[PDB]
Ligand binder design. Structure first.
Ligand SMILES: Nc1ncnc2c1ncn2[C@@H]1O[C@H](COP(=O)(O)OP(=O)(O)OP(=O)(O)OP(=O)(O)OC[C@H]2O[C@@H](n3cnc4c(N)ncnc43)[C@H](O)[C@@H]2O)[C@@H](O)[C@H]1O
Ligand SMILES: Nc1nc2c(ncn2[C@@H]2O[C@H](COP(=O)(O)O)[C@@H](O)[C@H]2O)c(=O)[nH]1
Ligand SMILES: Nc1nc2c(ncn2[C@@H]2O[C@H](COP(=O)(O)O)[C@@H](O)[C@H]2O)c(=O)[nH]1
Ligand SMILES: [Mg+2]
Ligand SMILES: [Mg+2]
Lengths: 463, 463
């Protein structure tokens, strides 16, 4: 039972829109919208969406496995050893939001301050005392973004596991000698840094020049969660505001995926005529290049929707019906929709590129979709007696229970914590996502003008 | 009754070290250490101090007035009009942590997200609707550190008030024409940006080449809070750990100020021999250049304590008794004291340069001294019925009460909030200062191995 299984189960349910059934549905944590900072929905004039892992949620572990296989095949084709071909994706190893340290080849789970919560070299979990050889203060400098790479997205799950696989492989293969910062193979030295760059380049290649998109599209049911409730929610949003799409992907892929997401024998609800996905949006923008999009962005272009190619030149004209934009900046959306940032609720899955950057750079209201929350709530609920025991105790009893708690989620523990310690991801969700949920669909269960409320915060001296 | 009056009152009290009197004293908010993140004092091996506004707390409003007069005199001497000479410091205008917008000439009080809480152009407080002409989203981009200057320290109070004075003066003087981004004087255009740079340069000059230090030292009782309890606390810290000083000031000034702070007819307690201030520190470091100090720093130098000049060359030797260092980096302290960052509690008043940077860059434990908390607690306590009314209501009743609440603190409101909205300063204290208090002296009231406890934080879905 993966998190995507939970999501597809809820996707298969039709919307009962009776005002009392709606209120009772959003009782269950799976269907709730969680609130970090208060948000009056009545004040939202534009709803903005990301596509990948927001509107288009890819099924797990099938899609991660596909990305993993194609990345591995790319590395073998550029010269990596044949043994890579015997790796197989394991969804129980990676948790999202890990930090790869390119100096020492470790995956790290850290808190908001760079304190080490978990350290794995290959599949070898480094316990407290031994991590002090490499991390004397059990701490990393987060501002050292050249050394440390944060694996923010579900697209990073395959490389998270692959990095550990590769480190495990070269360490244990007797054709290589292990050094502090990489591997010797006779007269060739491969640093963990160049190994990571090869993996990163290979993932990029698979997305950009490889066959991931082609393979996805030739089996959409296998790879993509589909929900009849999506057209209904979008169409209700359009009744009270403007709706826009801003994706880092290209038009041709967006068009294939979005057509699939709206492919039902009806429109917003059963019995209504089907309408093209594009009709649900006041503005469609592809090749966004987020987060640069929230800074200077790039030159605004117009897509030729017939050929899927860009028209030559910068687009200088106004918003017209049926136009599709490419590139531009968040100011494009504001200018064209007549919107200020706080009038916008932007719904995304990328904590850095969608959420943190739109908040800091533009003062947009934010909604973070966390697909794994589907499963994480189940574990949180039915394993709460473990956490409660931990909360009670607050020494090597603490270490044992922290471990058992964590193991329930996988080898790298919960997305949100290690025992009583919150992860960097958890703190960034709290700091930057005004609202969050397992799915944006949970907005369907809240009335037109709901007021999401979070308690006022007091400083220690104010209590 | 200024905040420094409150502090000097407590300074005049002798330490009653009876274990029950200590426990009862730290009941009162004035004498408490507040806790943002848990800290086991037993784990602290080195206590580090800043000098200015930490150990040496300058009396208010006398010291701010002195800085203000000397800055004004510097501006007049470089060509600013004679009318500046009739300005007089007003301690009721500035609150610390305001943001000067160099584009439009406004002082802004903002929250952690760049949302506008207060906007003053000169002495003209811009209400909601009118701020939208210049701030369409009632929001500033905090990452635009070229446009926005955050007035973090008590040293910035004189320029905070002076900036408002200057904008008020040129606006109302008919020899100048007001434009969006500054003032016309015939064929001369002075932008608010160049005006701010002149003020900034003039403050720097007063500190570096002017007579502020000379004037301070020729009247120390007038300008500097003195406390018999300081030698006692330092000497108790030295019993269980190492103690160090890291100041951005120069040796000669540090030596004058520190001699004064320890000038009592006794040592740690009445009846004990007086000892030189330097004897209380295992390591003394001047010209620190914080926050650069917490990055690459500068070359480590040795002070010639006879002449007050630097010895020629980089100091390559070991920690020796009686040596005084200059420049260097935070790694100097760790290497010389055999300390890891989490073994260090660093006590400072600069939220950015002492606290935020030592936390993020080095994983130091942090203690923020907030001198105004002395007065702010009094207002918080005896005006709590106003805040409580506000908390109850949570529309133009909200606006009225927010205003009346704020006015109790001064024209720019509390350091920590505007009504129910927390300031950027408040959020940075919570995020970056593990402990905080009105004075570092409050540590005297806590046992050798106290455990400061903050409640574990839960995400909305975890509650
Ligand atoms: N998940 C992720 N994956 C990959 N990368 C990620 C990531 N999350 C974050 N990053 C990037 O990692 C680097 C370090 O991250 P962080 O350490 O997270 O920077 P921050 O979250 O924004 O904290 P800070 O309180 O200083 O920020 P603020 O907006 O207040 O500061 C705004 C500006 O004002 C300055 N500033 C802030 N407070 C100040 C003060 N009190 N005085 C003077 N200057 C101040 C700051 O130095 C800054 O220049 C950054 O480049 C960040 O964008
Ligand atoms: N080149 C590259 N593209 C990525 C990577 N991760 C996600 N993408 C692309 O980002 C797009 C998703 O954008 P979204 O709709 O989420 O803004 C997809 O086209 C996907 O292929 C990556 O690691 N490298
Ligand atoms: N040049 C300059 N020096 C300052 C300014 N503010 C504080 N200082 C200096 O900083 C030193 C205080 O450093 P601390 O002991 O607080 O680290 C003092 O010498 C003081 O003159 C400023 O705005 N400009
Ligand atoms: Mg996405
Ligand atoms: Mg200081």
């Amino acid at each position: 039972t993966s998190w995507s299984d939970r999501l597809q189960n809820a996707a298969d349910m039709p919307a009962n829109m009776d005002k009392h059934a709606l209120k009772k549905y959003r009782r269950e944590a799976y269907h709730r919208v969680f609130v970090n900072r208060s948000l009056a929905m009545e004040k939202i004039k534009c709803f903005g969406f990301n596509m990948d892992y927001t509107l288009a949620v890819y099924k797990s572990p099938e899609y991660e496995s596909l990305g993993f296989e194609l990345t591995v095949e790319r590395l073998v084709s550029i010269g990596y050893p044949q043994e890579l071909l015997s790796f197989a994706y394991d969804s129980t190893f990676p948790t999202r939001g890990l930090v790869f340290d390119t100096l020492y080849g470790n995956l790290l789970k850290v808190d908001a301050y760079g304190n080490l919560l978990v350290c794995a070299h290959g599949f070898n979990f480094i316990r407290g005392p031994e991590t002090r050889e490499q991390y004397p203060n059990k701490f990393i400098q987060r501002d050292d973004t050249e050394r440390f790479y944060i694996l923010n997205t579900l697209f990073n799950l395959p490389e998270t596991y692959l990095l550990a696989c590769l480190v495990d492989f070269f360490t244990n293969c007797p054709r290589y000698t292990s050094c502090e910062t990489g591997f010797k193979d006779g007269d060739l030295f491969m640093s963990y840094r160049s190994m990571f760059q090869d993996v990163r380049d290979a993932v990029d290649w698979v997305h950009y020049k490889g066959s991931l998109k082609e393979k996805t599209v030739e089996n959409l049911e296998k790879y993509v969660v589909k929900d009849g409730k999506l057209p209904l929610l979008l169409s209700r949003m359009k009744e009270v505001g403007k709706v826009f799409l801003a994706t880092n992907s290209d038009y041709k892929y967006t068009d294939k995926i979005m057509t699939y997401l709206f492919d039902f024998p009806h429109g917003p609800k059963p019995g209504s005529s089907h309408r093209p996905w594009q009709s649900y949006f006041d503005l469609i923008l592809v090749d966004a290049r987020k987060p640069l999009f929230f800074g200077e962005g790039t030159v605004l272009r117009q897509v030729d929707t017939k050929t899927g190619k860009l028209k030559i030149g910068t687009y200088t004209g106004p918003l017209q019906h049926g136009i599709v934009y490419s590139g531009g900046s968040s100011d494009t959306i504001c200018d064209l929709l007549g919107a200020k940032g706080k009038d916008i609720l932007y719904i995304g899955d990328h904590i850095f590129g969608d959420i943190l950057k739109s908040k800091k750079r533009q003062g947009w209201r934010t909604f973070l979709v966390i697909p794994e929350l589907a499963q994480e709530l189940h574990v949180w609920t039915d394993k709460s007696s473990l956490f409660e025991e931990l909360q009670s105790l607050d020494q090597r009893r603490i270490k044992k229970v922290t471990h058992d708690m964590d193991m329930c989620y996988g080898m790298m523990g919960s997305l949100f914590r290690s025992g009583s310690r919150q992860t960097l991801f958890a703190s960034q969700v709290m700091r930057y996502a005004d609202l969050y949920a397992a799915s944006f669909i949970n907005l369907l269960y809240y009335p037109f003008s709901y007021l999401f409320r979070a308690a006022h915060v007091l400083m220690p001296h104010e209590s």
